[PDB]
């Protein structure tokens, strides 16, 4: 298939992997830090999603160095995914407008 | 760290009443509180998770409520097997912490002790020892006194007593009283007597046997 | 299928160390944490630490002096807690517990009773408690077993290999001269003894002994 | 400003016992508490940073615990050279503040 759609689907798959891996690693990094709340997996998965989408309610946040590094990877995976999809959409619309005008 | 306050430390109820255990967190922890039951010499058993969620295999008369800082474990109509210690535990922040526990105690009807006296075994006498064992079983309330007499003379040397905690089968108490002598001392007397004095009667309950 | 298997007892000399084990069965996930909880006799539950076997990382209660080191063998599904340089303040039951990464302890082991003492292990002597020839019975008869002179705690007393469960009292042990003594009591219908046998079974994990004593009527 | 309460002001222990100093913050400050030792006529010396983190050169019998508002400095088996004043200090909000100090006495 076309490259922009392959890249978008790839990025969605990788994003799902980053969300799951980041949830696991966030708990691993944050347990052992007194006061940390990112310490059970279901709510860590929720936190990783609202971090990837850049919503960040602030109901949960990492306090350790490694938990925050994981957060940064999650943010960047989410923003990159969303950028990839926007660009793929733009590419589709541009090509269909080229055809509709007769190139 | 989250401090969990369980107060009061002892709860006294009547059979079939509704009982409520309190657990208070030193700061707000949503619904991240879990409740465990621990019977005498048993390991803890999860009853309720996330403040109110049922566990399979746990009787439905257990429930929990609350959120924020104030949590309640409830038992609809308590029965003898609920006699136990009850602990809350939070999982909102690291580290996980426990409350200090509330003991459930049941106020049942008065019962006189069943008294049994046991001569030493012939096996034990072979090794040169002689223990006379007396059981005071299934009484209520827990206060009880036991006296030993040998040939009619009160004996206090060599008596070790032990009391059970409240019985999770019938809410009574029991006690053992063991008089240990050498074989030689045991053979120098004839009549051995255990005497139980309990609120249930003005007269002691008396059990004896003769070495002959 | 017991999900977490712990030895019943460890006797440790003061200053010495001991490695507690906790064999896990049932479902295992990468999100599992194994926890260790200390309970002094007559006291509450104290969290010691945790380990995630899928990764080997362990965290410890910061509020207490670190006596524990947690490891886990993924191939034998066993978690270990090494307690080192113990004193009598370390004498306690130590439980392991499995948390599926969602905050609560779904299942607990039976506990290992650790006694820190310089006294030597001693199996119990078990003696039958049968009524004297002049006692009279009603619809029930009370029998027992005297479990004398053992160290350390605990013993587990059963009747008829656990099949006889109703009507049983096992009294807390009393400690005298570095030896514990307790008795256990069983009440059965007086019509049914001695025609149906009554035997107590006394397990003393610290000496790996288990002995039977049949209760028969005296001469 | 963050008020740090150290109470009691004087702690009396026997040689070789475990001692615990309390420090309570007037509002929640995560783990941003640091502990200093000051001997007679000496300058303060950092013992523990961020509530529980070790400092190189400090004996291992010192440890710290807590988060939120309640902090504890602990000495495993106190000895004579631990006789000193002990201060906590927060760095969660400006300005940095100190607790009023606990004296260790043996
Ligand atoms: C002029 C100086 C500006 C630079 C400051 C240097 C910061 C040093 C960080 C490493 C020391 C660890 C101390 C510590 O405990 O750090 C974490 C909390 O435990 C804090 O988490 C953090 O430092 C967050 C890290 C964010 C990563 C940013 C990556 C950008 C793509
Ligand atoms: C950012 C990807 C690496 C994260 C590793 C986390 C491990 C935490 C160990 O404390």
Q: How far apart are CA C204 and CA D6, in angstroms?
A: 50
Q: How far apart are CA A65 and CA A56, in angstroms?
A: 18
Q: How far apart are CA C169 and CA B113, in angstroms?
A: 13
Instruction: Kindly report the three-state secondary structure assignment for every residue of chain B.
Output: CCCEECCCCEEEECCCCCEEEEEEECCCCCCCEEEEEECCCCCCEEEEECCCEECCCCCCCEEEEEECCEEEEEECCCCHHHCCEEEEEECCCCCCEECCCEEEEECCCCECCEEEEECCCHHHHHCCEEEEEEEEEEEECCCCEEEEEECCEEECCCEEEEECCCCCCCCCEEEEEEEEEEHHHHHCCCEEEEEEECCCCCCCEEEEEECC
Reading the block at residue B191, the tokens are 């009549």
* Residue D57 backbone zone (phi > 0: left; psi -120 to 50: alpha; other: beta): left
Q: Are A48 and A3 in contact (CB under 8 A)?
A: no
Q: How far apart are CA C1 and CA B207, in angstroms?
A: 46
Main-chain dihedrals φ then ψ at residue B33, nearest 5 degrees: -125, 140
Closest C-alpha among D85, D79, D78 to residue D104 = D85
Tell whether B97 and B132 lie within a shared domain.
no
Cα A22 to ligand 2 centroid, rounded to whole Å: 9
Tell whether B12 and B95 lie within a shared domain.
yes
Q: Are C21 and C76 in contact (CB under 8 A)?
A: no
Q: Are A60 and A41 in contact (CB under 8 A)?
A: no
Q: Is the domain defined by C119-217 classed in CATH 2.60.40.10?
A: yes
Handedness of CA B22, B25, B30, B36 (dihedral sign): negative
A27, A32, A34 ranked by CB distance to C101: nearest: A27
Q: How many CB atoms lie within 10 A of CB D39?
A: 13
User: What residues contact residue D18 under an 8 Å CB cut-off, 6+ apart?
Assistant: C65, D74, D75, D76, D77, D78
Reading the block at residue D10, the tokens are 């004087």
Closest C-alpha among C216, C141, C155 to residue C185 = C141
Q: Are C94 and C20 in contact (CB under 8 A)?
A: yes
Q: Are D37 and D83 in contact (CB under 8 A)?
A: no
CA distance A79 to chain B (A): 29
Tell whether B15 and B95 lie within a shared domain.
yes
Cα A62 to ligand 1 centroid, rounded to whole Å: 13
Whose CA is closest to atom 10 on ligand 1?
Answer: A65
Main-chain dihedrals φ then ψ at residue B165, nearest 5 degrees: -75, 175
Reading the block at residue B15, the tokens are 């059979």
* Residue B101 backbone zone (phi > 0: left; psi -120 to 50: alpha; other: beta): left
Q: Chain C 43-72, CB below 8 Å of chain D: which residues? A: 62-63, 65
The continuous run of DSSP H or E covering A34 comes out as none
Reading the block at residue C109, the tokens are 């082991």
Tell whether B4 and B89 lie within a shared domain.
yes
Write down the residue that tokens 């570095």 correspond to. Answer: C178
> For residue D30, what is the domain's CATH number?
2.60.40.10
Tell whether B29 and B42 lie within a shared domain.
yes
Q: Which atom of ligand 1 is nearest to the CA of A33?
A: 19
| Residue B68 structural domain | 1-108
User: What residues contact residue C177 under an 8 Å CB cut-off, 6+ apart?
Assistant: none
Instruction: Verify whether the Cβ–Cβ distance C55 to A27 is below 8 Å.
Output: no
User: Of B74, B89, B108, at which residue does a domain stop?
Assistant: B108
Question: CATH 2.60.40.10 residue ranges in chain C?
Answer: 119-217
Reading the block at residue C65, the tokens are 């002096």
Whether B124 and chain C come into contact, CB under 8 Å, resolves to yes
Q: How far apart are CA B8 and CA B85, in angstroms?
A: 12
User: Of B65, B87, B108, at which residue does a domain stop?
Assistant: B108
User: What is the DSSP secondary structure assignment for residue A57, as one 8-state letter?
Assistant: -
Task: From residue C33, give the alpha-carbon distance in Å to each of A39, B1, C40, C99.
Answer: 11, 20, 23, 5
Handedness of CA B152, B156, B162, B167 (dihedral sign): positive
Pairing of strands B145-150, D70-75: unpaired
Q: Are B11 and B21 in contact (CB under 8 A)?
A: yes
Chain breaks in chain B (C to N over 2.5 A) after: none
Instruction: Verify whether the Cβ–Cβ distance D64 to C62 is below 8 Å.
Output: yes
Q: Is A4 in the pocket of ligand 1 (CB under 6 A)?
A: no
Q: Are B111 and B140 in contact (CB under 8 A)?
A: yes
User: What residues contact residue A8 under an 8 Å CB cut-off, 6+ apart?
Assistant: A84, A85, A88
Q: How far apart are CA B115 and CA C92, in angstroms?
A: 34
Task: From residue B89, give the alpha-carbon distance in Å to each of B15, B97, C41, C68.
Answer: 27, 6, 20, 21
> Experimental method for this entry?
X-ray
Q: Are C139 and C190 in contact (CB under 8 A)?
A: yes
> For residue A96, what is the domain's CATH number?
1.10.287.70
Q: Are B79 and B15 in contact (CB under 8 A)?
A: yes
Whose CA is closest to atom 2 on ligand 2?
Answer: A70
Q: How far apart are CA C104 and CA A20, in angstroms?
A: 21
Write down the residue that tokens 């007037």 correspond to. Answer: D26
- What is the SS3 assignment for A71? helix
Tell whether B140 and B80 lie within a shared domain.
no
Reading the block at residue B1, the tokens are 């760290």
What pairs with residue D65 in β-bridges? D72
How far out from the chain centre does Cα C216 lie? 28
Instruction: Kindly report the three-state secondary structure assignment for every residue of chain C.
Output: CCCEECCCEEEECCCCCEEEEEEECCCCCCCCEEEEEEECCCCCCEEEEEEECCCCEEEECCCCCCCEEEEEECCCCEEEEEECCCCHHHCEEEEEEEECCCCCCCEECCCEEEEECCCCCECCEEEEECCCCCCCCCCEEEEEEEEEEEECCCCEEEEHHHCECCCEEECCCEECCCCEEEEEEEEEEHHHCCCCCCEEEEEEHHHCEEEEEECCCCC
User: What residues contact residue D74 under an 8 Å CB cut-off, 6+ apart?
Assistant: C65, D18, D19, D20, D21, D62, D63, D64, D65
| Residue A36 structural domain | 1-103
Q: Are C69 and C55 in contact (CB under 8 A)?
A: no
User: What residues contact residue C119 under an 8 Å CB cut-off, 6+ apart?
Assistant: C151, C152, C178
Q: How far apart are CA C1 and CA C23, in angstroms?
A: 12
Q: Are C35 and C50 in contact (CB under 8 A)?
A: yes
Q: Are B205 and B188 in contact (CB under 8 A)?
A: no
Q: How far apart are CA C65 and CA D65, in angstroms?
A: 11
Residues in chain B: 212
Sheet holding B153-155, edge to edge: B153-155, B145-150, B191-197, B205-210
Whether D19 and chain C come into contact, CB under 8 Å, resolves to no
User: What is the DSSP secondary structure assignment for residue D50, as one 8-state letter?
Assistant: T
Extended strands (E) in chain A: none
CA distance B49 to chain A (A): 14
Task: From residue A7, give the alpha-carbon distance in Å to each of A16, A75, C141.
Answer: 14, 18, 83
Reading the block at residue D47, the tokens are 């013992």
| Structural domain count, chain A | 1
Closest C-alpha among A37, B12, B4 to residue C47 = B4
Cα D96 to ligand 1 centroid, rounded to whole Å: 20
Q: Is A68 in the pocket of ligand 1 (CB under 6 A)?
A: yes
How many interface pairs between A and D have CB atoms less than 8 angstroms apart?
12
A24, A31, A41 ranked by CB distance to C59: nearest: A31
Tell whether B151 and B166 lie within a shared domain.
yes
Q: How far apart are CA C19 and CA A28, in angstroms?
A: 25
Tell whether B104 and B115 lie within a shared domain.
no
- What is the SS3 assignment for D102? strand
Closest C-alpha among B47, B77, B45 to residue B63 = B47
Task: From residue D56, give the alpha-carbon distance in Å to each of A87, C205, D32, D79.
Answer: 52, 45, 19, 19
| Structural domain count, chain B | 2
User: What residues contact residue C77 under an 8 Å CB cut-off, 6+ apart?
Assistant: C23, C24, C25, C28, C53
CA distance A34 to chain D (A): 6
Tell whether B85 and B127 lie within a shared domain.
no
User: What residues contact residue D4 under an 8 Å CB cut-off, 6+ apart?
Assistant: D23, D24, D25, D26, D33, D88, D89, D90, D97, D98, D99, D100
CA distance D20 to chain C (A): 10
Q: How far apart are CA B25 and CA A23, in angstroms?
A: 27
Tell whether B100 and B18 lie within a shared domain.
yes
- What is the SS3 assignment for A78? helix
Reading the block at residue B90, the tokens are 């939070």
Torsion of CA D14, D17, D18, D22, to 10 degrees: -10
- What is the SS3 assignment for A53? coil
């Amino acid at each position: 298939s076309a490259l922009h759609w392959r890249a978008a689907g790839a990025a969605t798959v990788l994003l799902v992997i980053v969300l799951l891996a980041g949830s696991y690693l966030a708990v691993l990094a944050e347990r052992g830090a007194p006061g940390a709340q990112l310490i059970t997996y279901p709510r860590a998965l929720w936190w990783s999603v609202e971090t990837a989408t850049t919503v960040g309610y602030g109901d949960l946040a990492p306090v350790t160095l490694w938990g925050r590094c994981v957060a940064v990877v999650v943010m960047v995976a989410g923003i990159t995914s969303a950028g990839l999809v926007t660009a793929a959409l733009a590419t589709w619309f541009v090509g269909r407008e080229q055809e509709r005008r007769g190139h | 760290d989250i401090l969990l306050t369980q107060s009061p430390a002892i709860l006294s109820v009547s059979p079939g009443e509704r009982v409520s255990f309190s657990c208070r967190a030193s700061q707000s922890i949503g619904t991240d509180i879990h409740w465990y039951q621990q019977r005498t010499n048993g390991s803890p058993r999860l009853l309720i998770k996330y403040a109110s969620e049922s566990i399979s295999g746990i009787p439905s008369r257990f429930s929990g409520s609350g959120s924020g800082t104030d949590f309640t474990l409830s038992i609809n109509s308590v029965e003898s097997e609920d006699i136990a210690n009850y602990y809350c535990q939070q999982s909102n922040r690291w580290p996980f912490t426990f409350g200090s526990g509330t003991k459930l105690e049941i106020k049942r009807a008065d019962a006189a002790p069943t008294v049994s006296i046991f001569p030493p075994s012939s096996e034990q006498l072979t090794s040169g020892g002689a223990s006379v064992v007396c059981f005071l079983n299934n009484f209520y309330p827990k206060d009880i006194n036991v006296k030993w007499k040998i040939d009619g003379s009160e004996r206090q040397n060599g008596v070790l007593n032990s009391w059970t905690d409240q019985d999770s089968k019938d809410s009574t108490y029991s006690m053992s009283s063991t008089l240990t002598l050498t074989k030689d001392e045991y053979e120098r007397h004839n009549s051995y007597t255990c005497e139980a004095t309990h609120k249930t009667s003005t007269s002691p309950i008396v059990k004896s046997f003769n070495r002959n | 299928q017991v999900q977490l298997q712990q030895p019943g007892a460890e006797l440790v000399k003061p200053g010495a160390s001991v490695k507690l084990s906790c064999k896990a069965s049932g479902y295992t996930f990468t999100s599992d944490w194994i926890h260790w909880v200390k309970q002094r006799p007559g006291h509450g539950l104290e969290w010691i630490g945790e380990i995630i076997p899928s990764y080997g990382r362990a965290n410890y209660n910061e509020k207490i002096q670190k006596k524990a080191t947690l490891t886990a063998d993924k191939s034998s599904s066993t978690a270990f807690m090494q307690l080192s340089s113990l004193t009598s303040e370390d004498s306690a039951v130590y439980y392991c517990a499995r948390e599926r990464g969602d905050g609560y302890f779904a299942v607990w082991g039976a506990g290992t009773t650790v006694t820190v003492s310089s006294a030597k292990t001693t199996p119990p002597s078990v003696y039958p408690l049968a009524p004297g020839s002049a006692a009279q019975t009603n619809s029930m008869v009370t029998l027992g077993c005297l479990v004398k002179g053992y160290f350390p705690e605990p013993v587990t007393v059963t009747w008829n290999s656990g099949s006889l469960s109703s009507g049983v009292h096992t009294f807390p042990a009393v400690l005298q001269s570095d030896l514990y003594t307790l008795s256990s009591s069983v009440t059965v219908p007086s019509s049914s003894w001695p025609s149906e046998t009554v035997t107590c079974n006394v397990a003393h994990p610290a000496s790996s002994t288990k002995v039977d004593k049949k209760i028969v009527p005296r001469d």
